């Protein structure tokens, strides 16, 4: 799950 | 011309060099170049490749000490073992149990150590011209420029908020609080993010  | 010495720089000398993953890694320099009012940097690497690099593609394979790195500092950190640049927005005082705070070049923010950074050679006059997204460029121009300004959210835990991800607001809540840094937990998916408590994707009053 990416930054935000 | 190709140069020996520039500055501090020594041709032989180990670095740390920015590779097109954007990871930076071990090398040795093993050229100087000018052209014109330019300067290029031969690295090659320990594992694989050789580049040609510009001085804020470079860093020094040691670590800084604490005098000389400022808010707004270009620096490459321990991203979590990766090594990825970003830049200081915070030095060691009382409130952050003496860290630094780094807002790396992706967007994400970490508390790091000393011994976790290392300082880019030959920085940017606007450390933060160099970072490519052109969103989180424009914030750190902003946090730093405005530095020691710095608003934001007073949060507690257990605090139910509205935080944005992927363009929406989702309901939150807030689980700890460190330093400048608040952890959310999204109730959706229940998983957190550590977040900057001076992001306007925090709402406490929706």
Same mark, same amino acid.
């Given at each position: 799950? =990416? #930054?935000? | 011309?190709?140069?020996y010495?520039?500055?501090?720089?020594?041709?032989?000398? *180990?670095?740390?060099?920015?590779? *097109?993953?954007?990871?930076?890694?071990?090398? #040795?320099?093993?050229?100087?170049? #000018?052209?014109?009012?330019?300067?290029? %940097?031969?690295?090659?690497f320990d594992n694989?490749?050789? =580049?040609?690099? =510009?001085?804020?593609?470079?860093? /020094?394979? %040691?670590?800084?000490?604490?005098?000389?790195? %400022?808010?707004g500092?270009?620096?490459?950190?321990? /991203?979590?073992?990766?090594?990825?640049?970003?830049?200081?927005?915070?030095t060691?005082?009382?409130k952050?149990?003496?860290?630094?705070?780094?807002?790396?070049?992706?967007?994400?923010?970490?508390?790091?150590?000393?011994?976790?950074? /290392?300082?880019?050679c030959?920085?940017?006059?606007?450390?933060?011209?160099?970072?490519?997204?052109?969103? !989180?460029?424009?914030?750190?121009?902003? /946090?730093?420029?405005?530095?020691?300004?710095?608003?934001m959210?007073?949060?507690?835990?257990?605090?139910?908020?509205? #935080?944005?991800?992927?363009?929406?607001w989702?309901? =939150? *809540?807030?689980?700890?609080?460190?330093?400048?840094?608040v *952890?959310?937990?999204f109730?959706?998916?229940?998983? !957190?993010?550590?977040?900057?408590?001076?992001?306007?994707?925090?709402?406490?009053?929706?």
């Amino acid at each position: 799950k =990416s #930054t935000x | 011309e190709n140069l020996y010495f520039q500055g501090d720089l020594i041709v032989s000398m *180990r670095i740390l060099g920015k590779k *097109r993953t954007k990871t930076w890694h071990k090398g #040795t320099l093993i050229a100087i170049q #000018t052209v014109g009012p330019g300067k290029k %940097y031969k690295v090659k690497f320990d594992n694989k490749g050789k =580049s040609l690099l =510009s001085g804020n593609h470079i860093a /020094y394979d %040691y670590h800084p000490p604490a005098d000389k790195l %400022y808010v707004g500092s270009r620096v490459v950190a321990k /991203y979590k073992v990766w090594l990825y640049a970003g830049i200081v927005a915070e030095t060691p005082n009382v409130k952050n149990k003496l860290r630094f705070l780094i807002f790396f070049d992706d967007g994400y923010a970490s508390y790091v150590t000393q011994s976790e950074l /290392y300082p880019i050679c030959r920085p940017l006059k606007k450390t933060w011209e160099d970072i490519e997204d052109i969103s !989180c460029r424009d914030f750190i121009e902003e /946090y730093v420029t405005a530095y020691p300004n710095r608003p934001m959210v007073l949060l507690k835990s257990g605090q139910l908020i509205k #935080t944005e991800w992927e363009g929406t607001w989702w309901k =939150s *809540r807030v689980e700890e609080v460190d330093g400048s840094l608040v *952890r959310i937990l999204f109730l959706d998916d229940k998983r !957190c993010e550590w977040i900057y408590r001076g992001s306007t994707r925090l709402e406490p009053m929706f």
